[PDB]
Amino acid sequence: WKKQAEDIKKIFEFKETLGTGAFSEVVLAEEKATGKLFAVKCIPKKALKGKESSIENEIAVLRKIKHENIVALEDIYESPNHLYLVMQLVSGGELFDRIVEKGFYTEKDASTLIRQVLDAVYYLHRMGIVHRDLKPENLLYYSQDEESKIMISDFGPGYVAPEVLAQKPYSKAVDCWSIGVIAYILLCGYPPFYDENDSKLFEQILKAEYEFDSPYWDDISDSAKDFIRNLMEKDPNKRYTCEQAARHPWIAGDTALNKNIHESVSAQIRKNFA
Ligand SMILES: Nc1nc2[nH]ccc2c2ccccc12
């Protein structure tokens, strides 16, 4: 299942970096033999010592499975000192860019986005993967198309579950928390937790102290607010799972509203982000 290469540059031409890490980089790559473009995660095997066999095991499982809302693992190359995960390149744009660019945006749009995330994350959970890093930057649109699906582009402070911050043992529930936070931002354009002093901010998250403040939340449905409250629940045992969230009427039913909330959400995204 793994292809072997003396040197990865015999296969690909590496252009821009798409993403970095202490010991991992995702690069835009052209397959020299075909012209086709991919996102290639470059991993030093030295960074895997003590886990190489087990990581390779897991990658071998995931290579055979494509989820609609997760970038596909197209191929694995192994060179003498590196592993290369050849991934589907996504061209559709970043999540917030499209929302600010759209001229029309409703709760039903936000609900459609979260439903996709729930589906992807449920699958990852079944496979034994806790993402731990779900945030808007890891969500990319497949195409520039109007009807484009959203995709998780990559998997292994303000988005992290209280039980983590409290240095406590944690589970797949941490992802359901993050999804709640993303849904919060999708409905108002600002993060639910933020402060100057990290001591304030850490405590706000620990205590799950947030509000649906006016005027931003005034035209948002009770159903959406309830949805978010069930995911941004301090107690991971009471917190909705992905499966429970996907059954909530705001997702599964018809309670998501049809009101154009673009003007306020986009103004807040512009003002709250770089
Ligand atoms: N356009 C992109 N496609 C990608 N497919 C898999 C990862 C990834 C990626 C990672 C960082 C930045 C951009 C992209």
Q: Which two tokens stand for residue 201?
A: 């901010």
How is 42-58 classified by DSSP, letter by letter? EEEGGGGTTTHHHHHHH
Please tell me the distance from the alpha carbon of residue 96 to that of residue 57, in angstroms, as a whole number. Answer: 35
Please give the method by which this entry was determined: X-ray
Half-sphere exposure of residue 263: CA atoms within 13 angstroms, side-chain side: 4
Instruction: Please name the residue whose Cα sits nearest to atom 7 of ligand 1.
Output: 153
Nearest-CA neighbor of 119 among 105, 139, 99? Answer: 139
CB 23 within 8 A of CB 43: yes
Q: Among all residues, which ones are annotated catalytic?
A: 133
3-state helix, strand, coil in the chain (%, to 5): 40, 20, 45
Tell me the backbone φ, ψ of residue 149, rounded to 5 degrees: -70, 160
224 lines ligand 1 (CB under 6 A): no
Element (H, E) at 169: none
CB 105 within 8 A of CB 254: no
Please tell me the distance from the alpha carbon of residue 46 to that of residue 42, in angstroms, as a whole number. Answer: 12
Tell me the backbone φ, ψ of residue 172, rounded to 5 degrees: -50, -25
Q: How far is the CA of 40 from the centre of ligand 1 (A)?
A: 8
Q: How far is CA 144 from the centre of its chain?
A: 18
Q: How far is the CA of 181 from the centre of ligand 1 (A)?
A: 22
Any alpha helices (H) in 25-161, and if so which ranges? 52-62, 95-101, 107-126
**Cα–Cα separations (whole angstroms), residue 31 to 15, 132, 239:** 11, 31, 44
What's the order of all strands across the beta sheet hosting 82-87?
A: 3-4, 73-78, 82-87, 37-44, 24-31, 12-21
Element (H, E) at 4: strand 3-4
What's the order of all strands across the beta sheet hosting 93-94?
A: 93-94, 139-141, 150-152
CB 191 within 8 A of CB 158: yes
Please tell me the distance from the alpha carbon of residue 4 to that of residue 9, in angstroms, as a whole number. Answer: 12
Helix (H, G, I), strand (E, B) or coil at 199: helix
Tell me the backbone φ, ψ of residue 24, rounded to 5 degrees: -175, 135
Tell me the backbone φ, ψ of residue 81, rounded to 5 degrees: -125, 5
Q: Which residues are annotated as a binding site?
A: 18-26, 41
Any residues with CB less than 8 A from the CB of 162 and at least 6 apart, and which? 177, 205, 206, 207, 208, 234
CB 116 within 8 A of CB 273: no
Domain ranges in the chain? 8-89, 90-274
Please tell me the distance from the alpha carbon of residue 27 to that of residue 187, in angstroms, as a whole number. Answer: 32
